[PDB]
Amino acid sequence: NFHPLLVSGRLRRYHCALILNLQKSPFTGTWNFTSCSERHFVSLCQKYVKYLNNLYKIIPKTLTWHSAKRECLKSNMQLVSITDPYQQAFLSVQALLHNSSLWIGLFSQDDELNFGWSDGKRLHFSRWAETNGQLEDCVVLDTDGFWKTVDCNDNQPGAICYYSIPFQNCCYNFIITKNRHMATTQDEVHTKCQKLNPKSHILSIRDEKENNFVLEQLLYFNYMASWVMLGITYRNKSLMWFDKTPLSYTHWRAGRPTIKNEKFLAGLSTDGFWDIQTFKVIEEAVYFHQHSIL
Amino acid sequence: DTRCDAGWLPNNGFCYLLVNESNSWDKAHAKCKFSSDLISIHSLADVEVVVTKLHNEDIKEEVWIGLKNINIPTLFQWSDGTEVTLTYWDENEPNVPYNKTPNCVSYLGELGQWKVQSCEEKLKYVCKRKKRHGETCYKIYEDEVPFGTNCNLTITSRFEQEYLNDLMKKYDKSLRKYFWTGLRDVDSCGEYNWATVGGRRRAVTFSNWNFLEPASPGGCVAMSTGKSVGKWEVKDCRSFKALSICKKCPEGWQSFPASLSCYKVFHAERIVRKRNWEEAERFCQALGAHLSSFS
């Protein structure tokens, strides 16, 4: 369970790993690695209903979605809604203890393009399963802990119901197209986004509040988007931007990177951890120009 | 570009050659008058030509030069020509006898002074074959209140000091005037070396101070010409009005290990602007790179 955003994987003082919690983050449970000569906490040791201010009720009856909604509505109960990682893990472990895939409560409005929970709370969590599976407008919690996108007008062995852009003198844009150019990706971007309008340079960080702004703007259409790109590439035998201007805000992880290749992967984390990843295969470009930030 | 035959060093058309024969004055007047003419001094560069040659000048020796005088009283005239412009005699032995029909004159000393020997012995000689100085100019301004804001004069040898001395004596006609030389120190320690605008580390070879000039552990020395002519005067250089004379492969990489270094050079046409090795420290130093490292 190593999410490829905080670890550098390529063709390769002890190294020891730990689990990092990020105060109710959509990616809770990330694995980091540092020197284990320091002191940290130990919580679990492995040998051979009310939960977190919420209430849950499971029914083992075999019935449809609206039927389960009507069954739960008599006791003033609403169908399950996943908006936190802890309750998601609890729902998954309860479904595994029941040994079945139970109903998930939500519905869309216009041909499974705008999904929304029945609470009226802004989307802050996404744990979808696959991209080529959006055939219908409902989701089901599977065994692996993802959201299989199907039609929930079926008969599952049970159900569960619970109870409880211009910014700072700059304009951005988002491109949703399909591309296949996998060569010479260091001297085209300037001429690519310069033809759109004059006075248009690649995104440079000269302030401190733009990172949080683009972070809050990211989690809007993150169905299949999980990585963030940067404009730091091989420039003048160094790690700088594309334009002829020096760098001020360092975006390095630790130590001193010495990447001499013509390109690399400068990524942005979920909280703002500066991350660099050297690549040997170009099969990480999905994720570079099709559904990413350009 | 007049080139002479095997030894005659040229300077402005003519050329000189020293003969390795030790003979009297009459035999020398009969030998190079060889189809040659005796030496005659007319400028300043030929003095340098005479001093730098002669096998370290043969310090303990004398050289002949043709000067004649028949009528009384004494009246020197060249054997071939009448361009009497420069006289460089020793200080101060004129050696002019009472009365003598045969006259003679000789280079003495490393500086090349003129003396009048008896010319009854055998010695060597030199004979010939058919502002500015000759290699560099020397300019002077009208007034110089600050200390070396446009030029910094640097001296190396003694003959250059003699040349600047005769230049300034041809310029100067009165006393109470000072000059500037490249000799100062900013560390206020006491060490005196050839001053410059930064980057001077040569060792001092020659020095002409007075009896007791240096009395200050610093400052910038001067140069007067009233009585103690040609010597370095010492005085503070905080604010001293004095003139000065000025001398006028992961991906996309190409390299070769025959020099034990990975290079990166560019052409002169495919580039945007002409690029050199100067400001590369702004871009390549981020990878521990430096100038062309060849062993």
Q: Cβ contacts of residue B90 below 8 Å, gap of 6+?
A: B108, B109, B113, B114, B115
Please tell me the distance in Å from A185's CA to the nearest CA on chain B: 12
Cβ atoms of residues A260 and B250 within 8 Å: yes
Contact state of B284 with A260 under an 8 Å Cβ cutoff = no
Query: Which residues in B lie closer than 8 A to residue A258 (C-beta atoms)?
Result: 287
Cβ neighbours of B252 in A, within 8 Å: 262
Q: In 3D, which of B130, B112, B4 has the Cα closest to residue B64? A: B112
CA of residue A55 relative to chain centroid, distance: 27
Compute the distance between CA of residue B220 and CA of residue B25 in angstroms, rounded to an integer. 50
A236 contacts on B by Cβ (under 8 Å): 283-284
Alpha-carbon gap: B199 to the closest alpha carbon of chain A (Å): 31
Amino acid at site A177: T
CA distance B264 to B261: 10
Kindly determine whether residue A239 and residue B286, on different chains, have CB atoms separated by under 8 Å: yes
B51: tokens are: 């001093």
Method: cryo-EM
Query: What is the residue whose two structure tokens read 């919580």?
Result: A43
Handedness of CA A82, A88, A92, A93 (dihedral sign): negative
Rounded CA-CA distance A8/A172 in Å is 29
Query: What's the longest Cα–Cα distance across chain B?
Result: 96
The residue type at B285: Q
**Preferred mutation among B249, B251, B261, B270 to probe A, highest tally of A CBs within 10 A:** B251
Helix (H) or strand (E) run with residue A192 in it: helix A189-194
A288: closest CA of chain B, how far (Å): 19
Q: Which chain B residue has its CA at the smallest distance from A257's CA?
A: B287
Are B144 and B246 contacting, i.e. CB atoms less than 8 angstroms apart?
Answer: no
Which helix (H) or strand (E) covers residue B65, if one does? strand B63-65
Q: Which two tokens stand for residue B274?
A: 């002409």
Q: How far is B14 from chain A (nearest CA, A)?
A: 60
Contacts for B156 with CB less than 8 Å, ≥ 6 apart:
B205
Dist. CA B122–CA B125, nearest whole Å: 10
CB < 8 Å from B in window 238-257 of A: 238-239
Contact A119, A82 (CB under 8 A): no
CB atoms within 10 A of CB B199: 5
Which of A 182-241 lie inside 8 A of B, CB atoms?
Answer: 236-239
Question: How far off is chain B from A240, nearest CA to CA, in Å?
Answer: 10
Distance between CA atoms of residues A102 and A114, nearest Å: 23
The SS3 call for residue A150 is strand
Mutation for testing the B interface, residue in A240, A252, A261 having most B CBs under 10 Å:
A261
A164 touches A145 (CB < 8 A): no
Q: Sign of dihedral through CA atoms B104, B107, B112, B116? A: negative
SS (H, E, C) B70-102: CCCCCCCEECCCCCCCCCCECCCCCCCCCCCCC
